[PDB]
Ligand binder design. Structure first.
Ligand code: HEM
Ligand SMILES: [F-]
Length: 291
């Protein structure tokens, strides 16, 4: 199967800029959510979980179809907590009903990263809604208590290499883990809603102890109050991952650049862009538009 991108009929850059804007403003205005973290991180996760189902071998899942809107995907245990992101975006969808679900879901992540001072993430449009029968089964998203060979292996199915994996992981600077959702509890860092390389810095410069949490899973905790999933901690256990973690903890700049490529790619996996499609869009932030 091939998924051809198909621009929403007669729409162009500034149409999408308006949708960025709406999302970016609600982000600004509902800022009490999760004890002041806001919606940015949960939108980033939604963007990733809606693309992260892709299977490179047969082209199933992925961001195209917006399948997250159907009961099966929406209630995947791996998706617990994301309801809040969909619930944020539902009113934005009603105001721009002409946008595909795939475009909304993925644009949400791109907006959230920029609005949190991350790099610009070129974004392309033309995900087309597909029917309920195209929804991938549960279980394509990664288990948290696994190791480096598990993470490398898992991410091969997304066509991501070592660099992309580590870059994309740095997204764990945003938000926290929530016991009721995933069986883990605690943020990865302090600058909870600002996109930085704090993730690689905390990985390397904290003294972690392995511990049981109240759900009876183990996680690596620091005296500072931070945590790391075993998959997170695996990135310093693997010598080839360690090297790239060092690079990013060192050069926020090279990380932003790499994350930007990986995210767009992640968000576009599975999609065939016809030869005469529009170039990727780069959207202005609220601050660039004087807010
Ligand atoms: C081995 C790969 C990964 C694993 C095992 C993993 C696992 C998890 C878990 C258990 C949570 C906490 C969920 C909760 O309790 O609310 C989480 C949060 C999060 N993940 Fe990942 N994740 C992975 C990769 C990624 C990627 C590739 C991205 C995006 C590029 C990402 C972005 C986020 C964000 C932004 C949050 C926090 C959401 C919030 O605070 O509500 N993660 N992840
Ligand atoms: F995640």
């Amino acid at each position: 199967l091939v998924h051809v991108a198909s621009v929403e009929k007669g729409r162009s850059y500034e149409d999408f800029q308006k949708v960025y804007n709406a999302i970016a403003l609600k982000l600004r205005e509902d800022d009490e959510y999760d004890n002041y973290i806001g919606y940015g991180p949960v939108l980033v996760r939604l963007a990733w979980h809606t693309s992260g189902t892709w299977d490179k071998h047969d082209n199933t899942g992925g961001s195209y179809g917006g399948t997250y809107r159907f009961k099966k995907e929406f209630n995947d245990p791996s998706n617990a907590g994301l309801q809040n992101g969909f619930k944020f975006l539902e009113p934005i969808h009603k105001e721009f009903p002409w946008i595909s679900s795939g475009d909304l879901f993925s644009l949400g992540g791109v907006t959230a990263v920029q609005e949190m001072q991350g790099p610009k993430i070129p974004w392309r449009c033309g995900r087309v809604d597909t029917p309920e029968d195209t929804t991938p089964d549960n279980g394509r998203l990664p288990d948290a208590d696994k190791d480096a060979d598990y993470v490398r292996t898992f991410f091969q199915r997304l066509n991501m290499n070592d660099r992309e994996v580590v870059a994309l992981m740095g997204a764990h600077a945003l938000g926290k883990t929530h016991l009721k959702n995933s069986g883990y509890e605690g943020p990865w860092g302090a600058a909870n809603n600002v996109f930085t390389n704090e993730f690689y810095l905390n990985l390397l410069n904290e003294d972690w102890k392995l511990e049981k949490n109240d759900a009876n899973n183990e996680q690596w905790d620091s005296k500072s109050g931070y945590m790391m999933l075993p998959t997170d901690y695996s990135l310093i256990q693997d010598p080839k991952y360690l090297s790239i973690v060092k690079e990013y903890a060192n050069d926020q700049d090279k990380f932003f650049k790499d994350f930007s490529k990986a995210f767009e790619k992640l968000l576009e996996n599975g999609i065939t862009f016809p030869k005469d499609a529009p170039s990727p869009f780069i959207f202005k932030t609220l601050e660039e538009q004087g807010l």
